[PDB]
Amino acid sequence: MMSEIIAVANQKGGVGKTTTAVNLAASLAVHEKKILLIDFDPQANATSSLGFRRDKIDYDIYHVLIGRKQISQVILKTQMPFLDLVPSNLGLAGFEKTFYDSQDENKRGELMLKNALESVVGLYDYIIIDSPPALGPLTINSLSAAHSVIIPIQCEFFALEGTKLLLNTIRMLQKSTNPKLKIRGFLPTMHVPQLNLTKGVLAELFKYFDSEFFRDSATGEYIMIPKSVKLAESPSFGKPILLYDIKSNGSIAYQKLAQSILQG
Amino acid sequence: MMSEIIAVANQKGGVGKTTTAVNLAASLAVHEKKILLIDFDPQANATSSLGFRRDKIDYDIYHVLIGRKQISQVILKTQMPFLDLVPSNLGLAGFEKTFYDSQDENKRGELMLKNALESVVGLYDYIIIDSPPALGPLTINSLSAAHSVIIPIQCEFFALEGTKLLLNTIRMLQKSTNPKLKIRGFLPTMHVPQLNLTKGVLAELFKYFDSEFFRDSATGEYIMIPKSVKLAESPSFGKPILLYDIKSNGSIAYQKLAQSILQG
Amino acid sequence: MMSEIIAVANQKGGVGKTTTAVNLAASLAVHEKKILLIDFDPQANATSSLGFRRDKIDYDIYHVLIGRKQISQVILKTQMPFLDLVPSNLGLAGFEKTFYDSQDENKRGELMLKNALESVVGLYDYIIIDSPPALGPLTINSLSAAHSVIIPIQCEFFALEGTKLLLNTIRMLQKSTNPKLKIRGFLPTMHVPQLNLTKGVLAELFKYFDSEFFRDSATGEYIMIPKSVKLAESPSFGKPILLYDIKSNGSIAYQKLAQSILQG
Amino acid sequence: MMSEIIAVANQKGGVGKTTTAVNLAASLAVHEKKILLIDFDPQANATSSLGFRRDKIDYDIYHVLIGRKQISQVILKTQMPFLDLVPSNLGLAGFEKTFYDSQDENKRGELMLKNALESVVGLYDYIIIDSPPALGPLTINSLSAAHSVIIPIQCEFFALEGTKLLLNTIRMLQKSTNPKLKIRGFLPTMHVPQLNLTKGVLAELFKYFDSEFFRDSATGEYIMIPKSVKLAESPSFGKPILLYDIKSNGSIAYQKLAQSILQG
DNA sequence: TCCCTGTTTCACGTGGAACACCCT
DNA sequence: AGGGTGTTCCACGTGAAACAGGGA
Lengths: 264, 264, 264, 264
Ligand SMILES: Nc1ncnc2c1ncn2[C@@H]1O[C@H](COP(=O)(O)OP(=O)(O)OP(=O)(O)O)[C@@H](O)[C@H]1O
Ligand SMILES: Nc1ncnc2c1ncn2[C@@H]1O[C@H](COP(=O)(O)OP(=O)(O)OP(=O)(O)O)[C@@H](O)[C@H]1O
Ligand SMILES: Nc1ncnc2c1ncn2[C@@H]1O[C@H](COP(=O)(O)OP(=O)(O)OP(=O)(O)O)[C@@H](O)[C@H]1O
Ligand SMILES: Nc1ncnc2c1ncn2[C@@H]1O[C@H](COP(=O)(O)OP(=O)(O)OP(=O)(O)O)[C@@H](O)[C@H]1O
Ligand SMILES: [Mg+2]
Ligand SMILES: [Mg+2]
Ligand SMILES: [Mg+2]
Ligand SMILES: [Mg+2]
Description:
4 copies of one chain form a homotetramer. Chain A is of the alpha/beta class. Helices cover 42% and strands 14% of the residues of chain A. In chain A, helix 1 (17-29) packs across helix 12. The longest helix of chain A has 18 residues, at 158-175. One magnesium ion is lined by residues 17-18, 41, 43, 45, 130 of chain B. The structure holds a DNA duplex. It is classed as dna binding protein/dna.
């Protein structure tokens, strides 16, 4: 078995990584492929996006990382049979400090998620890592474990400057800890295609990275997640979009994305 | 003269800390008050919004915090004569580790920005601090220096959970490092007033904090930053809203906010 | 006992006079008051709305008006024991010529229904008259017999000229043949409260005649017949609504109107 | 030219005779065919639907009928260059009386409009006569003058029985005054296709007249004018649909009606 | 059989954004 | 260009109507 580990990371906040991670885990699970979703955000927004109470959460990914628990100990099962969740909690914040301690003694600790996943990388088809809004210790784990990264891009101004910096970190890890690391693609999120700022910022990213933009290679048209209030309602009902409204366009786009991920 | 030091912070990403910080700084500056805007985010989105190139930026608040530099050295003057900026860069990220080097050694380092600011706090009326989307060391400095905090709320689902944690952290620092700290107000931003998820999240937040909401005290009415494409186009021109589009509603909103802050 | 003789008239077609007449008669009959419903329309829409067969009906109000029959001869008893019907047929169309013959012969004939009615006017509590869509002879009789008039209003454009014109003709008779005639009230019908044309036409009519709009005198709110497919399904079963579907909103409306008419 | 005369008549009120007449005149005028539209209704709602004043109308179809005027004297020009209007006014009511005087002397007067129209039957391609909600003298004139009749049917209950009666009158004229008379078709109006009452009355009327239903010769499919609030606003701006909102479904439908009429 | 609640589909109103005139 | 004007597109909310188990 070969888990593809796809890290949904992007250091910018509010750009759709928790909406993308949760909902791709879902929309790929319905393709009857076994999905594990890691919640690497100390806010634990993905955990709650699937209906859990972080407050009624005993053991989570932190204790796996430091070795106090096996990752197979913490996995929870979700309302979707094919989607299982490694939940998160505020305790994951501690990991920041933890990380630098290894940085002081043996320059490891980028690869803690790498080791924590090693024991289930054959039990799942896809392991999707929802990353927190930083380029800090946690995000670096997320990338180091990963086969590829999915980059949610909200076509507003700062996502210009932001992206290159992120890619910079990628290359750095591509020369340092994770050689295999590929960009699985760029994913426009919250898309409003008729705004002019969006036309411009998309055009810029096209210029530097059109080859990285997700196309449903079935019809080749670009796959962009539409701004959908329904997409932002779905976690409130402890549900993906698939279980909350399978016919809304948020869902259509995230299933199209899953199709594209699958076609190769 | 004694600057009110006001941190626009919130640990959730994309919620308007940077947009509110830039545009409150500007909308107060035109009111003929001398403002310093600190960019406490390694993303340097506030710097970038005022038209600078982070990449053609020499020394920043990082070198201030490590003592290599004076806070008064790094200040740049902006296209508004009354608004000054302390810029940022990824080097500020390094502070993460620097902070914990204090936590291991003498359990301070909460109050670093407080001390570096000490030398410019009488040279300004308001010091407006744009925070990063975390509860880590940087936001801890950002809050601890501050007299009061402005909490921009994106009225969607997670604004529920997050907010409670944020205030608790506020309460925590009030009982440890900054006892004088006040909540200046909550700030609904990107407001689509007719959406149902918004009505709901506003209702919950009203029940728990209705009095802490920015009111146009002339009419008592709520002050809410409307979703406005122009509010998000303006930094692509390195301009605040009032220099980019003074008549749009994003702008009118921020000047009502600024007026409210001045009235007390 | 002195039956109030209430004419539901309006010169525009399809505005609910036949639906209002049937359903007010029924909603008052359920209040244990004895009601006679005159079908003054050669279409005999009120007749068939109560389940009779215009074709298997022998003698009708025509032969009453020409004296060939007593008004007490043509009355049929209906599916409601307290509701009686003077039925109609196409032969009532003949009366047009006949009217002008009286116009030619003794300058009466507006008051023919009045005369034909004299023999049943104390035998009923309310005598409810479904008028045809004109200001011609039949409607002139119908107003001339009547104590008061109920004007069903379809809140579209032509209700504007139309309304004031109907009121005009009312005043004419009030100064000539039937001065006692009172406007029992105005009744918005088929009411869709959110359409903009309705808002506009209602606002116009309000400015000119708000005091005439039927109010739930219990709660003072307006009485408006909601658009109810069932209100239009009921006559196909030869039934009023309260015999058809008493919990529907059309039904509650007509009963609220009935309460209002009795309430004073 | 040989003017086709199409009388839009049906005795039930509020079934679309006037919205249909006005709008077919318009949708036919735009095929660059010369249209003369008679307002044969004393309410003259067709006149007022074309932006004219009953208040500003000097000579109208009444004075033509009594011979005091030429039809060519009263014709007006409309905002559409290929559509001209013979307007109406409440004085047309007088014609009722007029008709019976001839019934008393030489049993003519069905053929008054026929005679008045005699002078423009080569100057127009189509002359469209909007009838009042009666089977009275005017409606009979309109049918007698006309080559064919267009019958708007609102698929509710009373338009079941009503239809049979109307056809009877056709046959009467077809046997007495007007042998050429054709039913150009039945035209479903205010159509709500998913209501069950509408399905049913359609099914019934299909049963009896399935061959009389207007087919868009393009798809063979039935042409049924949808409930369109915009179709009902159009007279408030003195305009047809095609000048007021040419892309709404009201307009497309009245245009399809125009094409079907044109093919023959 | 009488009822009661979850879903669909559809028109219409609303308010934002782009765009094209248009003043002048 | 700057500073109105209205026209076109789209998402979302609403509320009515047909329908469908589900219910003993
Ligand atoms: N395509 C979309 N349309 C509408 N709303 C969306 C869309 N994608 C995401 N959202 C909403 O945007 C808000 C934040 O997005 P989300 O948390 O998924 O991004 P994030 O980067 O994970 O945030 P953070 O970095 O703070 O964890 C939520 O309300 C989310 O539901
Ligand atoms: N009132 C508003 N209307 C429309 N767009 C807005 C508004 N406020 C902010 N935005 C936009 O939303 C995007 C994210 O917002 P912004 O970066 O101001 O929030 P933030 O707090 O800076 O994010 P971070 O949390 O990472 O600092 C930006 O393109 C910004 O222009
Ligand atoms: N409030 C309502 N909701 C729904 N349908 C209605 C309503 N009121 C009337 N209708 C329907 O509209 C159609 C015509 O209304 P109705 O015939 O009662 O008015 P009318 O004055 O009788 O017409 P006429 O002017 O020819 O006598 C009927 O099938 C009727 O059932
Ligand atoms: N397709 C439609 N959708 C919505 N409203 C409509 C439609 N057609 C007509 N109406 C409106 O319903 C009302 C009456 O229709 P209209 O007067 O054309 O029928 P009518 O037969 O002319 O009435 P009359 O029998 O008194 O002549 C008007 O306000 C009319 O514009
Ligand atoms: Mg998240
Ligand atoms: Mg920021
Ligand atoms: Mg009637
Ligand atoms: Mg008419």
